[PDB]
Amino acid sequence: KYSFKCVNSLKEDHNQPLFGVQFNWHSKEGDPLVFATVGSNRVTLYECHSQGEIRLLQSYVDADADENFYTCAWTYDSNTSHPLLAVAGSRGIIRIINPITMQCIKHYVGHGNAINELKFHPRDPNLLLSVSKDHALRLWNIQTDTLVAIFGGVEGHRDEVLSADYDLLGEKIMSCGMDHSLKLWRINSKRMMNAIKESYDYNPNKTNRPFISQKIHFPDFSTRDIHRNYVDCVRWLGDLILSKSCENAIVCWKPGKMEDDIDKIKPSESNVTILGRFDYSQCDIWYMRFSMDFWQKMLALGNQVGKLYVWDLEVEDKCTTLTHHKCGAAIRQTSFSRDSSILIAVCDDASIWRWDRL
Ligand SMILES: COc1cccc(C[C@H]2CCCNC2)c1
């Protein structure tokens, strides 16, 4: 099984909740483990060191004090290998930041509507997915600064999209939100594939035409049958889904009946098969994420009283619970380092907790 120890803790001076944490899984052979935190109008980088040390690297303080960053996601430059950090929040502005300098190199506006989550495509580092308060999902190409596609309408989400994930190859997305529903959006169609090819052939300095985005109004599957409240986290586990609402369970399920293939599912599909549930407590509050290590061998989720749950997914039909006496605030998000040796928890009181695998 797995064991961890609290080697360090710190607190950011703004004292506003920290809504996001991400280790850089794109970092090179030799350089140190770096993680980013988001909360208030701040983006902060941290270097993990020996003897449980958490070294401050640099901060980005947005010019707008009314900005509230809710999410971050790392990528890299496909030509140079250099890491980049995407950040967004309440203002509905995506900012692409260079971690070496904290220079905002690129900024995107889909609308002026709050962005809840950012995800990068697992196969194309340029393809950025944003989920918004305006009930839509947006797919961006950050190499050419183009809006490839808008996912939503009457048949899309009927409320705020709180989370989304790409499958293993980035052939499809599963989004979820306040409308209690989880929706599938296929992005490997002849149409989306050509839209991505075109996004790359666009240059506004060499043409008068605008970039025409795909307007996808109909999901490929939809369900309101897994949770009976706001679904605030979703993640693919192969062809299966892990999702949670505020009902003290992470649910493992799949579209259709037990033996149905996800690629054979038609949009009209009325069934869902639940495969299991990860039960816990004191996580009845909205907006609490779960996280997985690189290998998807581990599942971590923080609760509203500062307790951190960890599960081994390699078990037959097990849990472990991480507590410290000075950790009482709600853990909004957790992040495992690429080598699964460090687990970082960020809280509502702007505190950062370091758990090392022993
Ligand atoms: C940390 O967990 C989550 C889960 C879902 C969404 C978000 C962004 C929120 C911030 C609070 C108001 N709604 C948007 C955070």
Side-chain angles (χ1 to χ4, degrees), residues 18-20 68 70-71 115-117 160-163 231-233 286-289 332-333:
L18 288 171
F19 287 115
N68 208 294
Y70 297 151
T71 181
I115 295 161
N116 296 327
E117 201 160 60
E160 295 198 33
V161 195
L162 296 179
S163 187
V231 192
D232 53 3
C233 201
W286 292 315
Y287 319 120
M288 301 288 270
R289 315 276 206 191
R332 293 287 166 183
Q333 197 165 41

Side-chain angles (χ1 to χ4, degrees), residues 9-10 12-27 29-50 52-157 159-189 191-196 198-205:
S9 181
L10 78 136
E12 305 196 348
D13 51 49
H14 55 84
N15 276 288
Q16 296 306 293
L18 288 171
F19 287 115
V21 64
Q22 303 290 328
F23 265 102
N24 177 24
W25 286 7
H26 302 287
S27 61
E29 163 72 6
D31 41 43
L33 318 187
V34 174
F35 73 90
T37 73
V38 289
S40 191
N41 65 322
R42 225 172 291 166
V43 185
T44 320
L45 291 196
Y46 295 94
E47 210 148 70
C48 279
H49 282 295
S50 157
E53 183 193 354
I54 303 159
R55 199 181 292 202
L56 214 170
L57 278 174
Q58 42 204 345
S59 341
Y60 175 88
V61 178
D62 199 287
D64 192 338
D66 305 272
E67 171 63 292
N68 208 294
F69 296 122
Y70 297 151
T71 181
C72 60
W74 295 85
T75 198
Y76 60 97
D77 190 298
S78 50
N79 293 294
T80 65
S81 83
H82 291 330
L84 296 156
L85 181 61
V87 302
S90 64
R91 291 265 110 128
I93 305 168
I94 309 183
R95 298 203 179 267
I96 307 299
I97 302 183
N98 178 349
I100 309 314
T101 58
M102 296 324 280
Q103 175 198 8
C104 181
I105 59 144
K106 279 165 192 279
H107 79 74
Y108 306 103
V109 189
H111 272 148
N113 289 107
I115 295 161
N116 296 327
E117 201 160 60
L118 294 174
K119 285 283 173 74
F120 275 106
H121 193 279
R123 278 181 56 234
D124 188 340
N126 298 313
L127 291 181
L128 175 65
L129 181 69
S130 62
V131 312
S132 183
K133 175 152 178 192
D134 64 32
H135 323 344
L137 281 85
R138 286 181 189 88
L139 182 72
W140 301 89
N141 177 335
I142 74 166
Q143 178 170 277
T144 62
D145 312 323
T146 44
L147 176 49
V148 187
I150 308 143
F151 302 82
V154 177
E155 291 308 322
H157 282 290
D159 211 330
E160 295 198 33
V161 195
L162 296 179
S163 187
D165 204 45
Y166 286 99
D167 71 336
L168 184 66
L169 300 183
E171 285 182 12
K172 53 192 177 288
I173 294 162
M174 197 68 89
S175 60
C176 64
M178 287 173 70
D179 68 355
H180 303 190
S181 104
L182 294 127
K183 308 183 183 286
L184 187 69
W185 313 91
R186 288 187 195 286
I187 59 158
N188 70 326
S189 57
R191 187 232 184 114
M192 279 302 311
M193 294 199 288
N194 178 257
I196 294 160
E198 296 289 344
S199 77
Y200 277 110
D201 295 348
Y202 190 73
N203 186 1
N205 301 272

Side-chain angles (χ1 to χ4, degrees), residues 167 171-172 186 188 239 260-265:
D167 71 336
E171 285 182 12
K172 53 192 177 288
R186 288 187 195 286
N188 70 326
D239 280 5
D260 293 338
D261 165 50
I262 191 129
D263 294 326
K264 291 283 172 182
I265 300 297

Side-chain angles (χ1 to χ4, degrees), residues 291-305:
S291 87
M292 297 205 82
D293 70 312
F294 175 83
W295 298 103
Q296 307 196 91
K297 270 157 102 99
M298 293 183 269
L299 180 70
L301 165 78
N303 83 0
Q304 79 222 11
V305 295

Side-chain angles (χ1 to χ4, degrees), residues 159-189 191-196 198-205 207-258 260-265 267-315 319-342:
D159 211 330
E160 295 198 33
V161 195
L162 296 179
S163 187
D165 204 45
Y166 286 99
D167 71 336
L168 184 66
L169 300 183
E171 285 182 12
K172 53 192 177 288
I173 294 162
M174 197 68 89
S175 60
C176 64
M178 287 173 70
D179 68 355
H180 303 190
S181 104
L182 294 127
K183 308 183 183 286
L184 187 69
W185 313 91
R186 288 187 195 286
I187 59 158
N188 70 326
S189 57
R191 187 232 184 114
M192 279 302 311
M193 294 199 288
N194 178 257
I196 294 160
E198 296 289 344
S199 77
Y200 277 110
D201 295 348
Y202 190 73
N203 186 1
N205 301 272
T207 197
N208 291 326
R209 57 145 177 141
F211 188 71
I212 313 295
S213 63
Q214 308 296 278
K215 327 283 198 296
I216 317 293
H217 302 283
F218 310 89
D220 291 284
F221 175 79
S222 181
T223 188
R224 283 183 66 88
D225 248 290
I226 308 295
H227 310 281
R228 281 163 297 188
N229 221 299
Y230 303 176
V231 192
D232 53 3
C233 201
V234 66
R235 186 82 169 83
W236 287 93
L237 188 65
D239 280 5
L240 319 178
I241 307 284
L242 290 167
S243 54
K244 65 171 289 299
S245 178
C246 61
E247 314 173 302
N248 287 317
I250 282 154
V251 181
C252 181
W253 64 278
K254 64 169 276 168
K257 47 194 76 176
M258 190 62 242
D260 293 338
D261 165 50
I262 191 129
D263 294 326
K264 291 283 172 182
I265 300 297
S268 62
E269 187 52 51
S270 58
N271 309 102
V272 275
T273 302
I274 293 169
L275 287 123
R277 287 185 204 87
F278 298 88
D279 300 292
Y280 48 90
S281 289
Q282 299 178 279
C283 198
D284 340 64
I285 66 150
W286 292 315
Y287 319 120
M288 301 288 270
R289 315 276 206 191
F290 60 81
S291 87
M292 297 205 82
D293 70 312
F294 175 83
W295 298 103
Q296 307 196 91
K297 270 157 102 99
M298 293 183 269
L299 180 70
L301 165 78
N303 83 0
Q304 79 222 11
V305 295
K307 303 210 226 85
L308 174 49
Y309 303 109
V310 174
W311 288 266
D312 192 329
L313 280 87
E314 296 297 276
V315 295
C319 191
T320 325
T321 190
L322 312 178
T323 32
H324 193 286
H325 190 57
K326 275 103 174 228
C327 198
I331 298 159
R332 293 287 166 183
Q333 197 165 41
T334 69
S335 189
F336 283 97
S337 58
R338 169 68 142 97
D339 60 7
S340 303
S341 68
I342 308 159

